[PDB]
């Protein structure tokens, strides 16, 4: 059920983010403070103490003063607070004060889901975005070889029967990606695909 920090760190190193990755974290991820460098991270919405709820990806682009928040569901800030109790202003504030000369940044976030409502692949979609990020940090959400393979649909449509095929097709290809790109995936494919299944939530 879900995906573990060990398994996403493995998959993220396999994707080439080794030189830029800051580890997976609970909601208390300190941010990007170490220095002004291409850095990205995977961040849970809850604390470690909850045993884990939802995976997000974060990236900092030094060339463009931009932090990307990636939720495979593409929820709004409000909907992030609401459903997951997750906020990340503390984290952005620490990152701006540290790296931004003018204490300002661009926060760029998804407005669409690539994830089915009952899928438990969030962690993995995060991996995928991070690959895209670490290769195309200027254009990571869309318009690059990696994210091109996914098909965004408006987050407002997450629960609608019209886009289920679409979010499923998204999962199958994600699996193909990670298959093609990650030795740690191929070695534990059968398992990760069972634990992260397109409708894991129905079969708990």
């Amino acid at each position: 059920s879900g995906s573990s920090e060990q398994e996403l760190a493995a998959i993220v190193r396999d994707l080439g983010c080794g030189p830029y990755f800051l580890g997976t974290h609970d909601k208390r991820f300190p941010g990007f403070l170490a220095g002004n460098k291409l850095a990205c991270a995977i961040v849970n919405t809850a604390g470690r103490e909850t045993g884990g709820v939802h995976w997000l990806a974060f990236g900092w682009n030094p060339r463009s003063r931009t932090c990307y928040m990636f939720d495979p569901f593409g929820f709004s800030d409000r909907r992030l607070k609401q459903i997951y109790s997750f906020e990340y202003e503390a984290m952005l504030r620490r990152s701006a004060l540290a790296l931004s000369p003018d204490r300002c940044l661009s926060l760029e976030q998804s407005t669409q889901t690539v994830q089915g409502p009952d899928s438990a692949a969030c962690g993995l979609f995060c991996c995928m975005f991070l690959h895209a990020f670490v290769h195309w940090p200027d254009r990571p959400m869309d318009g690059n070889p990696t994210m091109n393979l996914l098909t965004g649909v408006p987050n407002g449509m997450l629960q609608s029967p019209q886009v289920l095929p679409t979010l499923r097709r998204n999962q199958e290809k994600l699996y193909r990606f990670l298959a093609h790109h990650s030795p740690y995936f191929r070695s534990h494919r059968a398992a990760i695909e069972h634990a992260t299944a397109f409708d894991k939530m129905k079969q708990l």
Partner: peptide
């Protein structure tokens, strides 16, 4: 990929 939204955020 996904559409997205970019806000300037000052601290």
């Amino acid at each position: 990929g996904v559409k997205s939204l970019k806000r300037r955020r000052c601290y």
